[PDB]
Ligand binder design. Structure first.
Ligand SMILES: CC(=O)N[C@@H]1[C@@H](O[C@@H]2O[C@H](C(=O)O)[C@@H](O[C@@H]3O[C@H](CO)[C@@H](O)[C@H](O[C@@H]4O[C@H](C(=O)O)[C@@H](O[C@@H]5O[C@H](CO)[C@@H](O)[C@H](O[C@@H]6O[C@H](C(=O)O)[C@@H](O[C@@H]7O[C@H](CO)[C@@H](O)[C@H](O[C@@H]8O[C@H](C(=O)O)[C@@H](O[C@@H]9O[C@H](CO)[C@@H](O)[C@H](O)[C@H]9NC(C)=O)[C@H](O)[C@H]8O)[C@H]7NC(C)=O)[C@H](O)[C@H]6O)[C@H]5NC(C)=O)[C@H](O)[C@H]4O)[C@H]3NC(C)=O)[C@H](O)[C@H]2O)[C@H](O)[C@@H](CO)O[C@H]1O
Lengths: 519, 124, 106
């Protein structure tokens, strides 16, 4: 029944949106190159350029829009007539017997009528070693409509009829199928769902669900018929496993309650999270076959199936939303090279889906294409500025680069602390050393191997070697100079104060981290 | 434990009085299934009377039943109840009890595990 | 809403394939089920969702739908198959039963 919902003049809007994107990129590059100083004074070896003003304006507008969306969501209340059917879809491969039980109990004890909620769990690898998950599923839902099937096959390898009738007629269903991947189980569940439900909620085998997540998502979906998908806030079960887990939790809060909120202000959320997400069933059934059979210019994709789901939803003119009243708890890596592998995978999926997302910019707000362009072009300018200031041959240059990076991080952390109302977000300033060391080389590693474990060590080694050589060259070249001149003396009176401030900031941040974590 | 449904409270009653039939379930929980009351007049076809969904409170009746009859379900005894007041001479039939699943769409599942019949006679 | 069974009374021998047609004016989001009942006994479920077969029912019974019409077919009529067959259009807030279609013998 739903259609593409194209605009009245698709070609004109396409042309003007592409022209706007090209003009924005050209203007940003011209402002970066020109280095035109706006505000200046003496006795200060730094100024505010047009590029810096543009970045500050972008940060200000993103913060303002996120705050406005959060306030609007908080103020409004919705009926939730409780007349819509929901299907909770869980996929499992080898989930820990400790996390799957929590997930199943959370799904069972959610706050939604039992005659409107139907739970389906699909398990990969019916090799007699994965029956411990079906047994636990049966144990959790002993006194309900339970249908369990072991399918010696798959949808892309009878069983199909039994699977479909069990999923569409029963309430709690557990299907075990041959191993095909995360896409295979999700496709099997979506196809077996049919037209038996109105909304399809997607979950993982590890996510612990809040009791109000389903009802809040249904409430936000029922308000407007234009909405096709919605997400929710995702928390972390283990924020104290290591230093990486704590930073990951802070980054999760930031990316969910600032970036995603700002995107949802214009109803153009780019990605719906895996653990929390609701989709309209009719649109999903429309685009399911196309979504399954998608390749990146001749290569199958096994990454970012939630980002691709959101892209498919957006490609039909249907807007995606975000609500913070629905919460869930997931698990994040606590070890290096594993968080690094996850970040590399996410960057690969984002780069691969950027080209597909660029096709449907005309159907949504101009903020979508603006943010896509700026987020795509920011890291390259980051690297160029870093290289130039590193190899400029002055110690004050690298010191000021570090100070500027930390100042931007501190501004973001202060805004996050004010928005959340809680003070732990000041430690979000510590993500600068993680982004500048691993994430930046990982972006280029993902870009150079877009078509495709101790492998991402090499980009880290190259980046570290380049940085160390640059710092050594700058130190050598400033060691061979005469500082008796009154210009290098003002440079010295800046260097001393900057170093003192930098060390003091590092000391207070480390002390605050230890105080907040140890207690 | 095999699914069984037993009926109680049927008999003779003068017109205008009241009756309380009871449907005792065994082998399952009424909170995970629908409970329907179906009656068959002497020498006639089946007629649906009322339906109750426990843990949700959804009750449905018929045009010739609504207003007079009430349906409930007690989970402390794991039974269902049908209270018929303002009985008429036309309500004499054999009342059954049926179990079913839930309504999702074009798929329902059916009326599996029918109970026995209890006889109600409204006459002078 | 009205549910009409086409053959009110049907007679066939043993081994005869017999079909029963059932018409309902409300076929938007309501499932159609087919039940069988014998004298002095509670009805038993034969077919649900207008095509699926209940566990334990012999594979001779089958169900089909063609637009508004719903059909129940018995390929071979065994002596134990003589009973009264009923339709049911069951959705929330309204359930409607069919009537008649008593299968007899010559
Ligand atoms: C000679 C002459 O001409 N003049 C002389 C003077 O010389 C002059 O001196 C001055 C001077 O130095 O003072 C000098 O001026 C300076 O000039 C330079 C240029 O040379 C100029 O640059 C200076 O301005 C500053 O420059 C900075 C800069 O370089 O950029 C700039 O900093 C930047 O500001 C930005 C503005 O906001 C800011 O954004 C930047 O920070 C980064 O932004 C990124 C971003 O927004 O994209 C961030 O990246 C993102 O972060 C988010 C955070 O959460 C992440 O979430 C995100 O990752 C995504 O997260 C998702 C998620 O949900 O988690 C992921 O989704 C996942 O998807 C998968 C599937 O795909 C799913 O499976 C997962 O489930 C799902 N995840 C979950 C969870 O569900 C998703 O995959 C993932 O991608 C992340 N990435 C992206 C892509 O979004 C990033 O974090 C952030 O760090 C910031 N950059 C920083 C901090 O490094 C400054 O703002 C700017 O001010 C300029 N200086 C000034 C002051 O203006 C002159 O040039 C020079 O001429 C001389 O001084 C005088 C002396 O007298 O003399 C004159 O003559």
């Amino acid at each position: 029944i739903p259609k593409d919902l194209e605009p009245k003049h698709p070609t004109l809007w396409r042309i003007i949106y592409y022209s706007f994107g090209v003009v924005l990129l050209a203007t940003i590059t011209a402002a970066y190159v020109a280095e035109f100083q706006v505000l200046k004074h003496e006795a200060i070896l730094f100024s505010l350029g047009l590029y810096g003003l543009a970045m500050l304006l972008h940060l200000m507008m993103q913060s303002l829009f996120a705050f406005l969306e959060i306030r609007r969501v908080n103020k409004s209340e919705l009926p939730c007539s409780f007349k819509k059917t929901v299907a909770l879809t869980i996929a499992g491969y080898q989930e820990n017997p400790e996390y799957l039980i929590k997930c199943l109990e959370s799904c069972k004890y959610v706050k939604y009528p039992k005659d409107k909620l139907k739970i389906i769990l699909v398990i990969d690898g019916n090799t007699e070693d994965d029956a411990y998950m079906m047994e636990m599923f049966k144990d959790v839902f002993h006194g309900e409509d339970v249908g369990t099937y072991v399918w010696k096959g798959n949808y892309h390898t009878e069983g199909i009829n039994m699977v479909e009738e069990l999923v569409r007629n029963k309430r709690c269903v557990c299907i075990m199928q041959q191993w095909g991947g995360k896409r295979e189980v999700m496709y099997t569940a979506f196809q077996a769902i049919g037209t038996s439900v109105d909304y399809v909620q997607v979950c993982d085998s590890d996510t612990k669900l809040d009791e109000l997540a389903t009802v809040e998502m249904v409430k936000v979906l029922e308000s407007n018929d234009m909405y096709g998908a919605v997400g929710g806030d995702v928390r972390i079960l283990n924020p104290y496993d290591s230093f990486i887990s704590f930073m990951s939790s802070l980054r999760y809060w930031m990316a969910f309650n600032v970036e995603r909120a700002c995107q949802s202000y214009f109803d153009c959320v780019s990605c719906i999270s895996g653990p929390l997400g609701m989709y309209r069933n009719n649109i999903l059934q429309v685009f399911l076959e196309a979504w399954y059979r998608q390749k990146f210019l001749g290569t199958y994709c096994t990454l970012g199936d939630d980002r691709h789901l959101t892209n498919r939803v957006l490609s039909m003119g249907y807007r995606t939303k975000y609500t913070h009243k629905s919460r869930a708890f997931s698990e994040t890596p606590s070890l290096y090279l594993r968080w690094l592998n996850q970040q590399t995978r996410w960057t690969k999926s984002y780069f691969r889906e950027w080209l597909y997302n660029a096709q449907w910019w005309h159907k949504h707000h101009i903020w979508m294409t603006y943010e896509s362009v700026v987020s795509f072009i920011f890291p390259f300018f980051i690297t160029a500025t870093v290289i130039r200031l590193i190899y400029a041959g002055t110690i004050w240059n690298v010191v000021w680069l570090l100070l500027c990076i930390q100042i931007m991080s501190l501004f973001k952390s202060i805004y996050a602390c004010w928005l959340r109302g809680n003070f732990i977000m000041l430690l979000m300033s510590l993500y600068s050393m993680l982004y500048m060391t691993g994430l930046l080389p990982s972006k280029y590693f993902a870009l150079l191997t877009l078509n495709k474990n101790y492998m991402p060590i090499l980009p880290l080694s190259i980046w570290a070697a380049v940085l160390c050589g640059g710092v050594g060259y700058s130190i050598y070249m400033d060691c061979q100079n005469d500082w008796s001149t009154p210009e290098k003396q003002k440079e010295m009176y800046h260097l001393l104060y900057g170093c003192v401030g930098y060390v003091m900031y590092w000391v207070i941040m480390a002390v605050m981290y230890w105080v907040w974590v140890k207690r | 434990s095999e699914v069984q449904l037993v009926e109680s409270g049927g008999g003779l009653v003068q017109p205008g009085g009241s009756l309380r039939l009871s449907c005792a379930a065994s082998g399952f929980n009424v909170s995970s299934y629908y409970i329907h009351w179906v009656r068959q007049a002497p020498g006639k076809g089946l007629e649906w009377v009322a339906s109750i969904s426990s843990s949700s409170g959804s009750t449905s009746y018929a045009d010739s039943v609504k207003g007079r009859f009430t349906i409930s379900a007690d989970t402390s005894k794991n039974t269902a109840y049908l209270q018929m007041n303002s009985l008429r001479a036309e309500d004499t039939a054999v009342y059954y009890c049926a179990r079913s699943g839930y309504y999702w769409g074009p798929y329902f599942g059916g009326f599996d595990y029918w109970g026995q019949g209890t006889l109600v006679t409204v006459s002078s | 809403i009205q549910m009409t069974q086409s053959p009110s009374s049907l007679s066939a021998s043993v081994g005869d394939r017999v079909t029963i047609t059932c018409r309902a004016s409300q076929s938007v989001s309501s499932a159609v089920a087919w039940y069988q009942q014998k004298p002095g006994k509670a009805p038993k479920l034969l077919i649900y969702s207008a095509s699926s077969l209940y566990s334990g029912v012999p594979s001779r019974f089958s169900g089909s739908r063609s637009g508004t019409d719903f059909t129940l077919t018995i390929s071979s009529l065994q002596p134990e198959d003589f009973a009264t067959y009923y339709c049911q259009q069951s959705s929330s807030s309204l359930i409607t039963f069919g009537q008649g279609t008593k299968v007899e013998i010559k």
